[PDB]
Write a protein that binds this DNA or RNA. Sequence first.
DNA 1: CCAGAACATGATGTTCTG
DNA 2: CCAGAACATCATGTTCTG
Lengths: 70, 72
Amino acid sequence: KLCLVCSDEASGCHYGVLTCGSCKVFFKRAVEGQHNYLCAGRNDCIIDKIRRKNCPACRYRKCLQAGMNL
Amino acid sequence: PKLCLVCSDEASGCHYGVLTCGSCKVFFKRAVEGQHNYLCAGRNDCIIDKIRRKNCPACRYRKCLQAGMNLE
DNA sequence: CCAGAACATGATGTTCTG
DNA sequence: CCAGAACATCATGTTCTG
Ligand SMILES: [Zn+2]
Ligand SMILES: [Zn+2]
Ligand SMILES: [Zn+2]
Ligand SMILES: [Zn+2]
């Protein structure tokens, strides 16, 4: 039921992992994109339904640690 | 000189009482009028510079107020 | 049911206007 | 020179399509 990356309502098993739709397409664009994402914090941001917008670097990192893969 | 007191980018002039760049100018005005409720994902002390200022509206808004920005 | 594209919408930053 | 609106361009998220 819950996205393992942002804890929003999950939609299905995506890229190996139970995630929401927004996290699905974020992760695909991160991996297949340039993107030199820079954290404004300490590389340990909270990733929420809301706070996931704030830090792509941490969102992407949390995706990987969740086992998201192509 | 001159530098934005909010994000350290080049200031374009004195806006809402403070030396700021144009982007911080419109950001502030947008924030003090808008919805908004912003949430920090870090520890309420994010680095706000030209690079990172898009990351944390909450901290950028905070720096705007600390610098003394206001509508009058 | 899922990947990937598309189509809205959001958030931002520069330019134009008063 | 500055405020506010308008325009353009993102990043993000939902819906359509394979
Ligand atoms: Zn998610
Ligand atoms: Zn971060
Ligand atoms: Zn600024
Ligand atoms: Zn912050």
